[PDB]
Design an enzyme around this catalytic site. Structure first.
Site, PDB file in Angstrom:
ATOM      1  N   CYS A 386       0.963  -1.310   0.033  1.00 57.81           N
ATOM      2  CA  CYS A 386      -0.072   0.051   0.109  1.00 57.81           C
ATOM      3  C   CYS A 386       0.985   1.185  -0.172  1.00 57.81           C
ATOM      4  CB  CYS A 386      -1.023   0.040   1.173  1.00 57.81           C
ATOM      5  SG  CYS A 386      -0.056  -0.329   2.616  1.00 57.81           S
ATOM      6  N   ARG A 391      -2.084  -1.009   5.492  1.00 58.69           N
ATOM      7  CA  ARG A 391      -3.265  -1.783   4.805  1.00 58.69           C
ATOM      8  C   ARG A 391      -2.779  -2.999   4.041  1.00 58.69           C
ATOM      9  NH1 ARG A 391      -4.652   3.316   0.978  1.00 58.69           N
ATOM     10  NH2 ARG A 391      -2.417   3.634   1.229  1.00 58.69           N
TER      11      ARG A 391
HETATM   12  C1  LIG Z   1       3.423   4.528   8.995  1.00 57.13           C
HETATM   13  N1  LIG Z   1       2.238   5.444   9.231  1.00 57.13           N
HETATM   14  C2  LIG Z   1       2.044   5.009  10.610  1.00 57.13           C
HETATM   15  C3  LIG Z   1       2.926   7.040   9.324  1.00 57.13           C
HETATM   16  C4  LIG Z   1       1.177   5.574   8.359  1.00 57.13           C
HETATM   17  C5  LIG Z   1       0.283   4.319   8.637  1.00 57.13           C
HETATM   18  C6  LIG Z   1      -0.876   4.145   7.544  1.00 57.13           C
HETATM   19  C7  LIG Z   1      -2.376   3.877   7.981  1.00 57.13           C
HETATM   20  N2  LIG Z   1      -3.051   3.876   6.924  1.00 57.13           N
HETATM   21  C8  LIG Z   1      -2.027   3.892   5.966  1.00 57.13           C
HETATM   22  N3  LIG Z   1      -0.979   4.081   6.592  1.00 57.13           N
HETATM   23  C9  LIG Z   1       0.385   6.772   8.719  1.00 57.13           C
HETATM   24  O1  LIG Z   1      -0.448   6.934   9.772  1.00 57.13           O
HETATM   25  O2  LIG Z   1      -0.064   7.671   7.647  1.00 57.13           O
END
Ligand SMILES: C[N+](C)(C)[C@@H](Cc1cnc[nH]1)C(=O)O
Ligand SMILES: [Cl-]
Ligand SMILES: [Cl-]
Ligand SMILES: [Mg+2]
Ligand SMILES: [Mg+2]
Length: 430
Positions: A386, A391
């Protein structure tokens, strides 16, 4: 014509003769966890009648109940056959169908113990259902009571979150300790941390390779206007951490089906204590013990060139066509060429296409059939990805639960791919 409150009984013989009918929809009104295979009443054979769909009676209080039914393509012209642990649990569902213009509704009284108790009656189940635990299993675990699918003597319940301890402090499962997602993944790459970091982090949270880890998160309605919407997508984070822990070498990792909402929906007590950590000195296994769970960019490029391998893009449609990046910290917009699209949901922080309204995993047959329409099938080596691997971990976990033999997560995702200006990318509507 119909009686809203007196429902026709269908016999075992009649239902047996209708198992292959395209005009008949068999509806399991029990909990999704029982549908997946959990033997919630002590039945010897768990799971559902072969070909049955899942529609838990719990959802009857949901105002969107009729849309859920229609989204499942259950139509008024279908013959509806309901069953639960008892026919009495089907009565409200039967009335609800008739109130909405479904005129052909019957109740099967003999699912348990008649259907479950004879091996001639076909049943089905989610092959690795015991990794996706119901709230009652967790409650028995923390209460020190005898529970099925558990032969260990060491456990920890872990409440996952992304830099949001309030998600844990505002209410959590009793005895649970919190794990920030930053403990196991790096903010520089948004990939899993190095083995030496994972060893220390797991030990400092009290986790050994032989510890049963029960992960869950709290959904707190992510908003794209917030600086860190991921701080509200706690249960994606939990499955993300489940991926990293299994990759690292934790032998027995469970996920609470539906996350925190399933714990409170069951009526169990919650705690607001800030439980201190009970560290352990040695993790007890080499890290990573399951490296094949993770795929990096060089192997991902190979998988795009292979017949029996594919990358599975678990992003939103606006991300896929390059309309948005999906993130406030990513500027590049586009998609990896050659990947199979498997729309996650509305945006980067919602998984509507993989979840029910109560955040439990979507009926796995529906995930399996939609995947198959795009060639996402278990005979391939699949690398789900993703934006940054959250995801994709939840999609990957769903395939793992189905017993698929070679499923991975391409950790780097669009973040790592687009950070190299030499990498090709596509944009716009295909
Ligand atoms: C890796 N982090 C935690 C910074 C991401 C995790 C995430 C959640 N849905 C897509 N990505 C974010 O929160 O943007
Ligand atoms: Cl979530
Ligand atoms: Cl992509
Ligand atoms: Mg089935
Ligand atoms: Mg990543």
């Amino acid at each position: 014509h119909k009686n809203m409150y007196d429902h026709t009984e269908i016999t075992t013989d009649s239902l047996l003769a209708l198992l292959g009918s395209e005009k008949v929809k068999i509806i399991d009104v029990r909990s999704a966890d029982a549908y997946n295979g959990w033997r919630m009443r002590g039945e010897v054979r768990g799971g559902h009648i072969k070909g049955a769909k899942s529609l838990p009676a719990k959802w009857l209080t949901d105002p969107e109940w009729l849309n859920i039914v229609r989204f499942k393509q259950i139509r008024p012209e279908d013959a509806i056959v309901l069953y639960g642990y008892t026919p009495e649990e089907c009565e409200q569902t039967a009335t609800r169908f008739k109130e909405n213009g479904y005129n052909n509704v019957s109740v099967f009284h003999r699912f348990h113990p008649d259907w479950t108790g004879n091996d001639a009656f076909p049943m089905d189940r989610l092959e690795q259902y015991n990794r996706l635990v119901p709230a009652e299993w967790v409650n028995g675990l923390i209460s020190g009571e005898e529970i099925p699918e558990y032969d260990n003597d060491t456990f920890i319940v872990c409440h996952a979150h992304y830099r949001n301890r309030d998600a844990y402090l505002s209410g959590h499962i009793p005895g649970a300790t919190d794990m920030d997602t930053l403990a196991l993944e790096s903010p520089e790459t948004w990939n899993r941390r190095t083995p030496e970091e994972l060893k220390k982090a797991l030990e400092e949270h009290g986790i050994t390779a032989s510890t049963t880890v029960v992960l869950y998160g709290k959904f707190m309605h992510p908003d794209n206007a917030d600086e860190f919407p991921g701080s509200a997508a706690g249960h994606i984070g939990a499955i993300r951490l489940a991926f990293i822990m299994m990759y690292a070498g934790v032998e027995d990792v469970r996920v609470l089906n539906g996350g925190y909402q399933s714990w409170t929906d069951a009526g169990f007590a919650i705690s607001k204590d800030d439980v201190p950590k009970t560290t352990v000195p040695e993790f007890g296994a080499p890290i990573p013990s399951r490296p094949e769970f993770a795929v990096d960019i060089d192997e991902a490029k190979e998988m795009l060139q292979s017949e029996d391998s594919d990358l599975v893009c678990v992003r939103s449609y606006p991300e896929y066509i390059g309309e948005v990046s999906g993130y406030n910290y990513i500027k590049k917009k586009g998609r990896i060429p050659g990947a199979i699209f498997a729309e996650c949901g509305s945006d980067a922080y919602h998984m509507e296409n993989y979840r029910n309204h109560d955040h439990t995993t979507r009926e796995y047959h529906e995930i399996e059939d939609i995947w198959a329409k795009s060639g996402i099938i278990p005979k391939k080596h699949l690398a789900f990805y993703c934006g940054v691997g959250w995801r994709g971990s939840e999609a990957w976990f769903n395939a793992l639960l189905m017993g698929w033999p070679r499923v991975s997560v391409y950790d780097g995702g669009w973040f790592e791919w687009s950070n190299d200006p030499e990498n090709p990318y596509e944009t716009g509507v295909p």
